[PDB]
């Protein structure tokens, strides 16, 4: 018995087009259909410079924007050998972590709105509209902040942003507590989530989950502890790791990972060195407006970096960061030219949404939206 | 194993005046009345809402909204036709054609940003050498018809003169970065 | 005495040492079928001998873990059983030996990578206990 | 009649159709009106105390209806057959000899 389970609530899971082969109410197999959001991203990037390539990444995962620009930047610094300053690293993490918070605040309470709890959605989205007052203030666009450029980061924080991020972090433990007091204790929540989509660790490894769905099963594997790719080796934070694997562990993790991300934000705030914002290598970082206008040699680079590009040397690397969805890695083959060459984007949600087939076997049809909830399936990456 | 796991996870809470504590929580909703109480606290608290048309959300001088071609204080469009923004544009929205005007100084005969084919990433504002193209904080230009949304060659992007009073302010405050 | 492996699915095995001895003896016996002058057989022999030795010497699973610093004995059993699968697989489609042409181009690019880039750091040494 | 006929029994029958389609001079005596007994009260004054065994026997008939609807329409969907396929190893010959 085949059922074309589509997007239950649009605007939350946009193009979800499962084709469930059911058995009464018990689902026997879930066959997701991809491509409804397949923009030509892995082709369009081959046609544009390494700078023009960056805006696609904030548009790859639309609920955790800067994590993908941070995964791309670290793939055009893996090749460029472009050492970025300490302040660029600290800002880059303070925003990758603000993005982890922006994602878990959505991927928890959009999940909690698919399950049925209507209010956590709107509380978490007031919180997200506080964090977009930081995105929009530091770069310009509330969602797609093309801000974490290859060398360092686009431009320094405004002169009042750390004070505001602090005044937000002080009041954010309470918001997590409310999102938690409203959902963690509920017997209507546990019942809707405990023993739902349980993934034994061998399955989370096999299906390349590598995210909050690889730390549910108990595999202690965070690419901020495994492969520290910034000040992360300096910052202190504990990676919460589940013990059962059910969608109630992944929720409890995403609601603790939203507190450890608060620890990382507070650290990045309390220790942010007053250094240069971009790599001093002005052939990888366009010089400031003031310098390119006054200096002829800076003007030449501002011209050959906003038209030509880097021309990062010939290589091929797989740089993977811990994006909120999971291990978002961008395999970036680079022909010597200024344009990338098959900038393949390993995006979790392409490996997670595979897991829907075995996660939601023998679960009731109303659980198939809870699974899609805890996978944090955002179809931009799929 | 799940059978033994159940037996043990239920033999953990197996001492009187603990079975009673858990029974009371299930018998009289305790976690759920803590949900209702929080929900009530938020029902009575002030509302984080904004009656939009009259007051609008906070922005920043770096905010990227409607593209505006700036002008030099003494008229003379700031847009010398280098085509750097036409080059840097990721979506290739800007189409620039250049002609030595009769005065002799280069200028763009055609400077058409296609707003629909535009990602509002501010690359044009960065790439332009003289700050000729900047994004005005407008962001309120929803058009009834698509053809209007294609911003014509240097005529509608020349409406930035109205927004110059705010664009000049944002630039005077952002240029420090 | 072990309550549970934190990992889900890897069920705690009470008779860890015994099945480990069984698996490592099976592995030592089954590896004999691959040619001796193959790096795979030297490796299997060496680490299987080391783990079988440390499993015979020590008695508790905790001491097996402590000396043989390779995680948990349940994951060790997973590794040993997967190794037995591989040796019984390698017997088939035997890849041992090198054909005459053997063109293998080792390529080394030594460009240093910037430190602040994902670099898989080694992690704690078996002095974790 | 409303409840236990057109909210239960003809509900059953509707299910069997939808699925499984077939293809002046009175002298009112003002005594006994001083306390008017509603029909429920004057059925309960009898059914539960005086003729109570004809009420415990319909109890057994409702219990037999429960047992019957269970043993009939469990439809092998629970322990009636959801016990197991009941296949054992030591009782098998591993198909070496078909």
């Amino acid at each position: 018995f085949t059922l074309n389970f589509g997007p239950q609530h649009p605007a939350a899971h946009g193009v979800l087009r499962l084709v469930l082969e059911m058995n009464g109410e018990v689902v026997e197999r879930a066959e997701p259909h991809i491509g409804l959001l397949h923009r030509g991203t892995e082709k369009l990037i081959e046609y544009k410079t390494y700078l023009q390539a960056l805006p696609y990444f904030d548009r790859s995962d639309y609920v955790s924007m800067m994590a993908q620009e941070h995964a791309y930047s670290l793939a055009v610094e893996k090749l460029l050998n472009c050492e970025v300053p300490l302040r660029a690293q600290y800002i880059r993490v303070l925003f990758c972590e603000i993005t982890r918070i922006l994602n878990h605040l959505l991927a928890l309470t959009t999940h909690a709105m698919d399950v049925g709890a209507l209010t956590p959605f709107l509380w978490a989205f007031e919180e997200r509209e506080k964090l977009l007052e930081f995105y929009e203030r530091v770069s310009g666009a509330r969602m797609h902040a093309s801000f974490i450029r290859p060398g360092g980061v686009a431009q320094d924080l405004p002169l009042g942003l750390c004070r505001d991020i602090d005044s937000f972090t002080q009041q954010f433990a309470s918001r997590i507590d409310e999102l938690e007091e409203m959902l963690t204790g509920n017997r209507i929540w546990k019942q809707r989530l405990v023993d739902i989509g349980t993934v034994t660790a061998q399955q989370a490894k096999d299906w390349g989950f590598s995210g909050v769905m690889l730390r549910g099963p108990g595999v202690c594997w965070d690419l901020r502890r495994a492969a520290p790719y910034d000040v992360y080796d300096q910052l202190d934070f504990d990676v919460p790791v589940g013990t059962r694997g059910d969608c109630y562990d992944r929720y409890c993790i995403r609601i603790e990972e939203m507190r450890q991300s608060l620890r990382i934000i507070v650290q990045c705030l309390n220790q942010m060195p007053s250094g240069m914002i971009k790599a001093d290598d002005r052939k990888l970082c366009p010089p400031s407006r003031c310098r390119m206008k006054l200096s002829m040699e800076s003007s030449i680079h501002h011209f050959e970096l906003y038209t030509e590009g880097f021309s990062v040397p010939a290589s091929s690397t797989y740089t993977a960061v811990e994006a909120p969805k999971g291990e978002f890695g961008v395999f970036l083959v680079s022909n010597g030219s200024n344009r990338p060459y098959r900038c393949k984007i390993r995006a979790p949600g392409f490996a997670h949404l595979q897991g829907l087939d075995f996660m939601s076997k023998h679960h009731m049809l109303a659980d198939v939206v809870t699974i899609i909830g805890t996978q944090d399936i955002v179809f931009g990456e799929v | 194993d799940d059978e033994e796991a159940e037996q043990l996870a239920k033999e953990i809470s197996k001492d009187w005046s603990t079975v009673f504590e858990r029974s009371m929580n299930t018998l009289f909703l305790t976690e759920m009345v803590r949900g209702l109480s929080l929900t009530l606290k938020y029902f009575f608290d002030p509302k984080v809402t904004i009656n939009y048309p009259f007051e609008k959300g906070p922005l920043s001088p770096r905010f990227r909204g409607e593209h505006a071609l700036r002008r030099y204080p003494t008229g003379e469009e700031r847009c010398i036709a280098c085509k750097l923004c036409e080059a840097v544009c990721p979506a290739q929205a800007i189409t620039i054609e250049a002609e030595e005007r009769e005065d002799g100084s280069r200028r763009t005969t055609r400077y058409d940003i296609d707003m629909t084919k535009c990602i509002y990433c501010g690359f044009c504002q960065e790439a332009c050498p003289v700050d000729a193209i900047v994004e005005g904080p407008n962001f309120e230009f929803a058009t009834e018809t698509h053809e209007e949304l294609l911003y014509d060659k240097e005529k509608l992007l020349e409406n930035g003169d109205r927004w110059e009073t705010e664009i000049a302010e944002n630039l005077r405050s952002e240029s420090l970065y | 005495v072990k309550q549970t492996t934190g990992i889900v699915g890897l069920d705690v095995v009470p008779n860890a040492r015994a099945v480990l001895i069984d698996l490592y003896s099976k592995t030592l016996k089954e590896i004999q079928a691959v040619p001796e002058d193959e790096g795979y057989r030297k490796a299997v022999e060496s680490f299987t001998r080391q783990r079988l030795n440390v499993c015979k010497e020590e008695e508790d699973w905790e001491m097996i873990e402590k000396r043989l610093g390779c995680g948990q004995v349940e994951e060790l059993i997973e590794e040993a059983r997967d190794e037995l699968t591989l040796i019984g697989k390698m017997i088939e489609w035997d890849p041992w030996g090198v054909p005459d042409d053997y063109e293998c181009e080792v390529i080394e690019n030594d460009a240093p990578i910037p430190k602040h880039v994902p670099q898989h750091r080694p992690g704690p040494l078996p002095e974790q206990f | 009649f409303l409840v236990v006929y057109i909210g239960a029994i003809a509900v059953l029958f509707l299910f069997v159709v939808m699925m499984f389609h077939i293809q002046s001079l009175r002298y009112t005596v003002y005594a006994g009106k001083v306390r008017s007994w509603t029909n429920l009260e004057t059925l309960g004054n009898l059914l539960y105390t005086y003729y109570f065994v004809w009420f415990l026997v319909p109890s057994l008939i409702l219990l037999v209806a429960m047992i019957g609807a269970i043993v009939l329409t469990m439809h092998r969907t629970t322990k009636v057959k959801r016990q197991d396929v009941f296949r054992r190893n030591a009782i098998d010959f591993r198909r070496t000899i078909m």
């Binding site: 058995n23 546990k190 405990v194 023993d195 504990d238 013990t243 109630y248 679960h363 | 996870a9 | 704690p124 | -």
Partner: peptide
Amino acid sequence: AAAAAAAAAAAAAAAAAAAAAAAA
């Protein structure tokens, strides 16, 4: 249906961090 029902019993909540709390 013999499908495995979602048993809403489990072990009690105990926040499980990684071993790198104090000294890696």
